[PDB]
């Protein structure tokens, strides 16, 4: 899976926005591939990191990090006020066929669009 | 919203399966809401637990899928291996609705991208 530009569509609350994000190499220290949006400022861009490990089981980790900028008085370069995170960690075992892993990935993907999660995440109301 | 039956369509490798799951109560000790499939055996049941904290709001979603196997010289099947999944959102106090919706949709759409469908199915680094 060679790194390449990823254009995510239908993103947003209204399902109208879309974002293009391009790779920025792999860290040799721990093999964590990184991708980010060309936001003209390195400190105020949305970034994604993906890394699959090696065994006694495999572990896939995906992190999403996007900051929110603000122009505070007394300075010219905008700083970072608040920062939104997201973490995902699959923990498949050695003897797991690809069908089971695909099932896990698909149910996780479709569970983030069901009426339960799109409500428990947007308004932070606990499920009862 | 209160817990209710959740049905998921176009699930699987080819998107030709459907997974229906129903609630299984709420644990009062730590406030996790559970859901599970009607698998007719409590041990071999795909389950999903969702829980939001109260202050740095934190949202945690945990998915457990065990797999069965015919025990040698026995009748009751045992859980040979389990597939795990975890999601942890960490929105702050002043975050608006648009930012959280954007993060959720990003995680939902990126997870079906050609990069992730190969990183997860084929276990090859990017």
């Amino acid at each position: 899976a060679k790194l390449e530009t990823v254009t995510l569509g239908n993103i947003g609350k209204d399902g109208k926005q879309t974002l293009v994000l391009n790779p920025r190499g792999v860290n040799p220290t721990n093999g964590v591939a990184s991708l980010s949006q060309a936001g003209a400022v390195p400190a105020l861009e949305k970034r994604v990191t993906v890394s699959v490990s090696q065994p006694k089981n495999y572990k896939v980790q995906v992190k999403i990090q996007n900051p929110t900028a603000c122009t505070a008085n007394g300075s010219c370069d905008p700083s970072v006020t608040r920062q939104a995170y997201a973490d995902v960690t699959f923990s498949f075992t050695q003897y797991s066929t690809d069908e089971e892993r695909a099932f896990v990935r698909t149910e996780l993907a479709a569970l983030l669009a069901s009426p339960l999660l799109i409500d428990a995440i947007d308004q932070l109301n606990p499920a009862y | 919203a209160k817990l209710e039956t959740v049905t998921l369509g176009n699930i699987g490798k080819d998107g030709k399966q459907t997974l229906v799951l129903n609630p299984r109560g709420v644990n009062p000790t730590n406030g996790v809401a559970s859901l599970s499939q009607a698998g007719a055996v409590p041990a071999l049941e795909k389950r999903v637990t969702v829980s939001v904290s109260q202050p740095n709001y934190k949202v945690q979603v945990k998915i457990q899928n065990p797999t069965a196997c015919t025990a040698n010289g026995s009748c009751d099947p045992s859980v040979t291996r389990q597939a795990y999944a975890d999601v942890t959102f960490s929105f702050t106090q002043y975050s608006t609705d648009e930012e959280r919706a954007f993060v959720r949709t990003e995680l939902a759409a990126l997870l079906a991208s050609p990069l992730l469908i190969d990183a997860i199915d084929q276990l090859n680094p990017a």
């Epitope: 995510l8 569509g9 109208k16 926005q17 936001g39 003209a40 | -």
Partner: antibody
């Protein structure tokens, strides 16, 4: 979000023109303000936009010479000029807005030339 | 990109299940995930047009259920579910990635 203002400009000859689009209710932080032209008849074709995150000076080909898209961020208005007016000035020039790469959400009424 | 659409005029009067066909000269699966990039606009002869469908299969808020569409790699269609007294006039189609380009007629 709504956007309006126009003016039935009826000036002749190729001296100059100044069309404007006073957009309100939205900020230029991510959105793009397109300038689709309808001509007269069939098939209105795009004329460019202004995206701060994409450059803000993307112009359609075969329209580079007679187009100039300058946007003032103080009052949140976008206006353009056409240098030469011989036969391109035919009919309405719509003013458009939308997301960064999304569809065109809402269009205000256009000037008549 | 060029968007060649079905001939300018139709002949349906009332109630008939009439479909609008659009054909592109290039693949429109620009998005990394399989999402098309078409939008269908209808323009009355008097004022500015309105958006009807984006992603070629998703309706826009505040639009009646008649308008539905299906999308393939490059051969898309718009299937209005019967026509009422005022559902006429030009039905433009547009791809809206990188350089947009309209095209078509009634």
């Amino acid at each position: 979000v709504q956007l309006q203002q126009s003016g039935p400009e009826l000036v002749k000859s190729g001296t100059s023109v100044k069309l404007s689009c006073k957009a309100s209710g939205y900020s230029f932080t991510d959105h793009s303000l397109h300038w689709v032209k309808q001509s007269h008849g069939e098939s209105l074709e795009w004329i460019g936009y202004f995206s701060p995150n994409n450059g803000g000076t993307i112009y359609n080909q075969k329209f580079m010479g007679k187009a100039t898209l300058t946007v003032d961020r103080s009052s949140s208005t976008a206006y353009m000029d056409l240098h030469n007016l011989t036969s391109a000035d035919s009919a309405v020039y719509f003013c458009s807005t939308g997301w960064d790469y999304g569809p065109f959400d809402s269009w205000g009424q256009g000037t008549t030339l | 990109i060029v968007m060649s659409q079905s001939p300018s005029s139709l002949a349906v009067s009332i109630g008939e299940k009439v479909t609008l066909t659009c054909k592109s000269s290039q693949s429109l699966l620009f998005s990394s995930n399989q999402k098309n990039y078409l939008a269908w606009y209808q323009q009355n002869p008097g004022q500015s047009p309105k958006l009807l469908i984006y992603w070629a299969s998703t309706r826009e808020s505040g639009v009646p259920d008649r308008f539905t569409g299906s999308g393939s790699g490059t051969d898309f269609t718009l299937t209005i579910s019967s026509v009422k007294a005022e559902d006429l006039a030009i039905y433009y189609c547009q791809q809206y990635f990188r350089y947009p380009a309209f095209g078509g007629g009634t």
